[PDB]
Amino acid sequence: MENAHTKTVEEVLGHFGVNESTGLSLEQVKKLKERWGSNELPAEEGKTLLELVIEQFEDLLVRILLLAACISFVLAWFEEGEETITAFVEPFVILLILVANAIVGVWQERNAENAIEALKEYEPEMGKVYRQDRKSVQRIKAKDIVPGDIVEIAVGDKVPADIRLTSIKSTTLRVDQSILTGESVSVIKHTDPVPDPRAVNQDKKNMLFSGTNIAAGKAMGVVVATGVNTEIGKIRDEMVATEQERTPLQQKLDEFGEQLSKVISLICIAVWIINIGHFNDPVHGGSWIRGAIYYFKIAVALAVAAIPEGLPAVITTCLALGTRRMAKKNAIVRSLPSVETLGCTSVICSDKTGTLTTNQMSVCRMFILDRVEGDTCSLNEFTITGSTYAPIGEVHKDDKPVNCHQYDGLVELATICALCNDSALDYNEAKGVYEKVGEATETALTCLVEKMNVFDTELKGLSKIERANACNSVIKQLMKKEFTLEFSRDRKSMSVYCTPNKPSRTSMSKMFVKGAPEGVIDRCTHIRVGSTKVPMTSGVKQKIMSVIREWGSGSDTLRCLALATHDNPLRREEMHLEDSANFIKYETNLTFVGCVGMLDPPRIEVASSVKLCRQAGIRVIMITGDNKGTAVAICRRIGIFGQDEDVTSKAFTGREFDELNPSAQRDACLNARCFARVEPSHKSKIVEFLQSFDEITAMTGDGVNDAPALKKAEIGIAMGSGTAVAKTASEMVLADDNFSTIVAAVEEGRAIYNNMKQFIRYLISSNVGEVVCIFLTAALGFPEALIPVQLLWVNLVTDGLPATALGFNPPDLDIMNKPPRNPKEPLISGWLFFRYLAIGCYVGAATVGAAAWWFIAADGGPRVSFYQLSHFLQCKEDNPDFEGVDCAIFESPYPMTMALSVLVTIEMCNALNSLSENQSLLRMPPWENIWLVGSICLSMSLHFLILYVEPLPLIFQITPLNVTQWLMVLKISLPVILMDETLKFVARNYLEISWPFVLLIMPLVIWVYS
């Protein structure tokens, strides 16, 4: 079987020896699964190791350090090129920090992608087949499908394998195959063969390809290729890589990194042009170009220092962390940066059926017309026991066991339910439960027909399997279903044309209609009382609607459907079934038979999740296609409304929302919390009206009618048990159907953004202190305290792991107690610009003050005055101002070591400030981030290494410090913590305690300041 689209249906079915009615035998499946194997693709990993490392060096900030590492190599290859431990130390320490951030970024990306692919194994994919063991449709694993078995295909499903369409149950079958073809339109499929043998997949209009979705209709066909033999498995690796639009924060940090790179270039140019006079200094040898090259190395070393080279890697780590944390809560995040968009979400739009409710429906109430006395009527209401899809339960009229065969209206009510279905009941021996095959609404009617048993059948000896479709089969054996007018949300109903297998001479053909109660009743001209029909008056109409309103608004919040019959329908030849808009013109002059009400319990997690969303400034909206009275009743149950709150202006329908003023329709989206009776076209219209008011919308849906709205939203969340049409159009899938995972994703989206601002706060406020150190020494005339190899060491220990370990920060204790941020506001927000300069001005003056301390106040050095330090260049033995001062001490490595040690230590104490924007160290101690504590102890260990081993101080031109000089370093480095505690204090109490830590920090403060 190679060209299946060229052969007809009878030839492709005879190739395997299959009947479309029965299906494939169990022995045939065993033989075919041996010859063809499992129906799956080999589990391949996304990106290799080298290509994952290559994408770490693709940003501007990282590519700048690569250029400077090359400059430091070419400009040092001329001077010294023999020893590799004293000459090329500058290019080595610029690369060593790039590899460190590349390793962490790759390590976290490997963890996020290994966690997501381990979540695809959560629940196995399923496919409805027809096999000979069961005389009905059974749901089996998708990987258990062999080439040649009959497969049932319904709307919303995902095609499990390459399928040659044998018959189309609906009038039209649409398939969304952008995954394979690339077309963004639904394509109509037919049964006739395509004569062209070399036809492209575009012209294969009779084949269903694995991985594609069903946009509309129901059909069935025979599988012709499984596993890697499908058109999607043969090009599984030869596929173009996706590229999505940059989210507002992704482009924010990109434009911020470029604006920062321009400022750094002006700062490094300013370094070269203010040190013009020092070019001809005797220290360089009296040469101008020799002194200009040296101060060019300083400009380059300060560029590497002041640049946040770790910003691209920390964004990668944060996004990979949030993705791995959601996968722990069973949330497959399809787009890595999309977990950030849920942080700034303002509105959460939610599908009702299947998303806010468990979709475990059960018919618990139904009524038919008892009699008519005048214009009004009396009804026969019933109750059904049971809430599971198991066909175990009986019907009670007024709390009395009754048999449905006595009531003629119930016999016709079960006939409409059984025949007007595209669903069935399936028994699972593995789990020992009854499962649904199709939609929960139609399966609830299948389980109802089994309980009623209007044609009393002996069910005492049937198996658990055959008892799932026992009474349903008795109905279908009596009436032959000719064609179905499939359910369309334009008319909100579904009709079926049936002809009795009984001789047609006495009994004619009828149409069995079912759909929305208010829509179907408006099209009913007569009503069925018992076995006779009388014309429908008005008093019957409001009396019937009154029971439907009391059921939806009642204590059970019942989902209601009306059942009708059309006794005099047009024949098939006089019906134009090409357009779906004509179907409502055929479902007129019906005969109202009955109305069923089923219960759909909301999920347990939904009630508390709506409360936490309201606490975090988020507004939850219910956009459902169901009735308004039912939707409002559910909103009061889950907490969207109050049990007594007025919803006259907060609950709207599809019609009411259309018939609104521009001012009224503006205030509606800003105040309405429930939208009922809205088509899939209206749902996306609600979403675009919310985004028109500059609001990040998060749509949650599970069905076909939510797919246009899941794409119009900034981020769409899909339930794991919903259709694949919705899971394809979404950015996050809740594999476990947990609604609490949605609020956990909002907290993770806010926490990711917080860790970025703490990374931005630590590097800007500390690297500007390394710039002030270079410029303040020049404005005072002091000997410069740093050389290019020391500006590159402070870049390694301070901008490396202590900066990346900020992406592991724990969340604030009130992270979810603040309104969502405005995504169009500026990033740094002005008041933080003051906090960056306030801390940076101290970090710079502390470094210059540490070098000036040794020249003046230290005992190990000279007691040089301020005048002799400001004019050290003017010192020779001829000068009477400089007497007794050995002016070779102005080149001593002691002030350079005091400044380098303070710069490292004051930036480690600044990393301890960057755990929260406003929470002090007494509330969030440093051991909340254990990765930051380990990174700081590692950076200090590396600083103590180059200080006290033998050959390293000569490389970095430093000297070992004693305890007396190290105690002075902490005296200047510690007040950077006290300075940020003051800035956090003003932020808490004017712009808006861990005692174990206090007992540890004060013995250090006692020893430092004596």
Ligand SMILES: Nc1ncnc2c1ncn2[C@@H]1O[C@H](COP(=O)(O)OP(=O)(O)CP(=O)(O)O)[C@@H](O)[C@H]1O
């Ligand atoms: N198989 C079916 N046959 C006939 N009518 C159906 C039907 N499924 C749903 N309906 C009716 O169509 C009406 C509107 O269509 P829609 O599909 O949007 O409802 P819904 O079940 O999806 C609720 P939600 O939008 O919250 O998921 C529903 O109120 C329902 O009564």
Ligand SMILES: [Ca+2]
């Ligand atoms: Ca840097």
Ligand SMILES: [Ca+2]
């Ligand atoms: Ca730094």
Ligand SMILES: [Mg+2]
């Ligand atoms: Mg739904």
